[PDB]
Design a protein around this nucleic acid. Structure first.
Ligand SMILES: [Mg+2]
Ligand SMILES: [Mg+2]
Ligand SMILES: [Zn+2]
Ligand SMILES: [Zn+2]
Ligand SMILES: [Zn+2]
Ligand SMILES: [Zn+2]
Lengths: 162, 162
DNA sequence: TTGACTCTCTTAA
DNA sequence: GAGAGTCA
DNA sequence: TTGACTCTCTTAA
DNA sequence: GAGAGTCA
């Protein structure tokens, strides 16, 4: 809600609840042929999810608290960042999973960045393969690699140059 | 419906029309601190665009030809790839700009690949900065770089480990 | 047969 | 990646 | 007050 | 990144 104290109370109650979610170990590519280990705190697959949590989409949840007799509600991964600017360079800030695991609510696996920065981590070579993200990736992006391009650049005639 | 010869004729008429688009020289980052040059064949900003071309969205166009009294229409960048498979790994193939310039219709700046592969080129370090795309990028992706993350991973208490 | 508009849709963050 | 409404 | 559902929306390829 | 309709 409005005051700084109330926002801190929201963050603390969220952390305490998420801190009781099952801790699931995931071994992940780091880039550079190296592997690491992440510990994701995973929201349950089905209700009940935890105090204050409800599922609004297949992989979307919201956190809800009653403050000053009014219901306040946030996207479930946005709560750690409630004291941060909600935009950057005129772009909305989004919760962004460094572990690329939407059920995870570990705030040590989340950052707060534009949707473009968020998306781009999907292709990052990873912290041991050349990640240049200022807020460093925890793993190589799941979509990193050569791709599966069906056809490359080509012309039939002689009208074009690169 | 349309024979291989008729499809080749469509591709040829498309190339002949696009080849007359204004050719714009762009200096571009290649990665590795190097600069290169791309020559984009840019569809006009407003009608008329060229024989067979019409705008269906702010940065969307279609190519239309009528053959044996039947109207055929294609996305304007898909025409070079009409003799190629249209899906791969269960994913639809998309026209993908290697120059990241949607108005460009130079077929030497296009490839044909999944939407994920397409998107990922936005963050590629480029052909001189570590591109691993099997069909190599022509330039560093426009969104490559350290990003502008507002807040990184953090917790207030001690409930979490990474 | 053609141009210049109109509309809505897909994907996965 | 989001916000908000309907019920119990 | 809290839980468990429902719906549609944003972005930029 | 897409497909399709209307009108003259
Ligand atoms: Mg993400
Ligand atoms: Mg693209
Ligand atoms: Zn995680
Ligand atoms: Zn990274
Ligand atoms: Zn181009
Ligand atoms: Zn590349």
């Amino acid at each position: 809600a409005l005051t700084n104290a109330q926002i801190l109370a929201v963050i603390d109650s969220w952390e305490e609840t998420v801190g009781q979610f099952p801790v699931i170990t995931h071994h992940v590519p780091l880039g550079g042929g190296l592997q690491g280990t992440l510990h994701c705190y995973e929201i349950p697959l089905a209700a009940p999810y935890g105090v204050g949590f409800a599922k609004n989409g297949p992989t979307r949840w919201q956190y809800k608290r009653t403050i000053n007799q009014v219901v306040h509600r946030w996207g479930s991964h946005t709560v750690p960042f409630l004291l941060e600017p909600d935009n950057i360079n005129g772009k909305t800030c989004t919760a962004s999973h460094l572990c690329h695991n939407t059920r995870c609510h570990n705030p040590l696996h989340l950052c707060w960045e534009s949707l473009d920065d968020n998306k781009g981590r999907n292709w990052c070579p990873g912290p041991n393969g050349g990640c240049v993200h200022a807020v460093v990736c925890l793993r190589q992006g799941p979509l990193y690699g050569p791709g599966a391009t069906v056809a490359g650049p080509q012309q039939r005639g002689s009208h074009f140059v690169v």
